[PDB]
Amino acid sequence: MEELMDDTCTPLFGKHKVLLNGDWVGLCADSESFVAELKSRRRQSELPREMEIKRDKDDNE
Amino acid sequence: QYKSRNRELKLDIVDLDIQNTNHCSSDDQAMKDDNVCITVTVVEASKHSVLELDAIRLVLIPF
Amino acid sequence: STMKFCRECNNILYPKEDKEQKILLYACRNCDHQEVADNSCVYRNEVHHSVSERTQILTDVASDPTLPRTKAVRCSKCQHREAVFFQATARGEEGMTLFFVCCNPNCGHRWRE
Amino acid sequence: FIVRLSENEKAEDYKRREKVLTVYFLSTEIPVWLLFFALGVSSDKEAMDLIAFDGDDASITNSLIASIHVADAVCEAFRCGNNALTYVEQQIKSTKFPPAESVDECLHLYLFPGLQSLKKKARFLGYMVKCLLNSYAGKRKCENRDSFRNKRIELAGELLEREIRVHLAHARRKMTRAMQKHLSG
Amino acid sequence: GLQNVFQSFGEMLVEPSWRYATVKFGEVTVEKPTFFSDDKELEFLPWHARLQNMTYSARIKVNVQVEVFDILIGSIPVMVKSILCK
Ligand SMILES: [Zn+2]
Ligand SMILES: [Zn+2]
Numbered sequence A: 001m002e003e004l005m006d007d008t009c010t011p012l013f014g015k016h017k018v019l020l021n022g023d024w025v026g027l028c029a030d031s032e033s034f035v036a037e038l039k040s041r042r043r044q045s046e047l048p049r050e051m052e053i054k055r056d057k058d059d060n061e
Numbered sequence B: 001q002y003k004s005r006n007r008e009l010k011l012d013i014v015d016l017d018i019q020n021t022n023h024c025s026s027d028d029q030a031m032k033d034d035n036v037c038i039t040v041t042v043v044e045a046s047k048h049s050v051l052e053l054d055a056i057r058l059v060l061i062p063f
Numbered sequence C: 001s002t003m004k005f006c007r008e009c010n011n012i013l014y015p016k017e018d019k020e021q022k023i024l025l026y027a028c029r030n031c032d033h034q035e036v037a038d039n040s041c042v043y044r045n046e047v048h049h050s051v052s053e054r055t056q057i058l059t060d061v062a063s064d065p066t067l068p069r070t071k072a073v074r075c076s077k078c079q080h081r082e083a084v085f086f087q088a089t090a091r092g093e094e095g096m097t098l099f100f101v102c103c104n105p106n107c108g109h110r111w112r113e
Numbered sequence D: 001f002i003v004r005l006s007e008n009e010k011a012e013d014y015k016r017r018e019k020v021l022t023v024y025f026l027s028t029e030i031p032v033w034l035l036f037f038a039l040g041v042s043s044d045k046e047a048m049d050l051i052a053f054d055g056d057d058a059s060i061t062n063s064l065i066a067s068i069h070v071a072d073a074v075c076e077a078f079r080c081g082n083n084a085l086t087y088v089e090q091q092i093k094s095t096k097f098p099p100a101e102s103v104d105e106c107l108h109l110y111l112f113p114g115l116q117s118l119k120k121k122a123r124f125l126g127y128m129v130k131c132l133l134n135s136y137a138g139k140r141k142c143e144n145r146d147s148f149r150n151k152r153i154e155l156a157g158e159l160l161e162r163e164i165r166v167h168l169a170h171a172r173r174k175m176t177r178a179m180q181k182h183l184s185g
Numbered sequence E: 001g002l003q004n005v006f007q008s009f010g011e012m013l014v015e016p017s018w019r020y021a022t023v024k025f026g027e028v029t030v031e032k033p034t035f036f037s038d039d040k041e042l043e044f045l046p047w048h049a050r051l052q053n054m055t056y057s058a059r060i061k062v063n064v065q066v067e068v069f070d071i072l073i074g075s076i077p078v079m080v081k082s083i084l085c086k
Helices: A032-042 B053-060 D032-037 D044-050 D058-074 D083-093 D103-109 D120-136 D161-171 D173-182 E002-007 E046-051
Strands: A016-020 A023-028 B015-021 B037-043 C013-018 C023-028 C034-036 C083-088 C097-102 C110-112 D002-007 D019-024 E023-030 E034-036 E041-043 E057-066 E071-077
Touching: A023 D120, B037 B053, D002 D120, D019 D032, D019 D058, D032 D044, D032 D058, D032 D083, D032 D120, D044 D120, D058 D120, D083 D103, D161 D173, D161 E002, D161 E071, E002 E023
Parallel strands: none
Antiparallel strands: A016 A023, B015 B037, C013 C023, C023 C034, C083 C097, C097 C110, D002 D019, E023 E057, E034 E041, E057 E071
């Protein structure tokens, strides 16, 4: 996950947004390789088990 | 309906002629060669008090 | 409805017709700049009457009415009285001719006036 | 932070009667394009690149043009310098119960406290405007209360503390009102 | 849950108009439900509260410090078989 940019002039090319509890915390380039790598940490007791990881392509976030 | 309904707000309009034309010369998007065009022209009383764009866009078009 | 952007100000532009030149110009409100317009198009809109967004499918808006039915006729294949009638045109005719469609679910027959 | 999309009741000359984008922050209705220019944004181009619409509609562009017009009419030269922050300060300070802090610091702990930078909460504001325009254009469904996706239940961790707090607020008011009578001899 | 309640409140300064008052709250310490009888502090069970018609509750004690330039605050009802239960 990449850090959210600071300048208001840099546009988002294809980076999907990351919303942690409704708060924008970062950006991910490829979400299909991000959620699949994040669920493996949840299935190995490296993450909280009561954590919903949703990936929708309609809003790109 | 123009000559029988005064519910439109007054833009100091004395006449409103409508010229039917089957081929208009508006070079914007030539996508329909088998359609007709309707030109609505407002008659002004020798001034520019009607020539604003927002009133024509908001009152004359939905009327 | 068509909006353009300023060259140096990078703000919105407003259409301003020059009465002394009889042309169309786009003038920036913040910076003193009057750009040359193009094709004299200041408004364009595909007319869509969908002014009730996210509410047209709850109540019956009736944007597609039904065809009327009559029972004073009789079909050719089956001996049914109910039939759907409407008005349309043919492939090369000039006018409007009455058509019929049978209401029987096993008939499948249609005929003209 | 409530951002609505309704008709322009304020400064209506009976001709400009289209929809406009206004916000409801700290009981003060300001136009959204003044709040854009008050936080980092210096031009209309980068303010439209933040609200990425990528569509073709006539009710969105006309509403954005009306928002730009109501931002330029309510404040003179708001797109140059820091004239928008004065209007934001005067709109919060004219409320019935304004906060005692300065308005330059009220935009850092009240407007999106989960974000750090003052320019990032403008991008979040543009994202919030983009979601509203996508829901108005029919490309996004509204949130329904019947679904359990937008619903959270509370059994004892929120039902009991919200009754503990309304009694602690009375115990802290029955303490000062009895210590004030035993403080000055 | 109790620390977030007792830590999100800000006590205003008691100024009637020098000599002023300012009170604060510290750490939250909840005890176990006991019975304050005449002999000693006996063990209190949830069926003793059901048969004697009383509340199975535990007392809350917070650190109160008053500065000028373990105090009982209440009792919360206790659910049966909780993190503090007989
Ligand atoms: Zn035409
Ligand atoms: Zn038949």
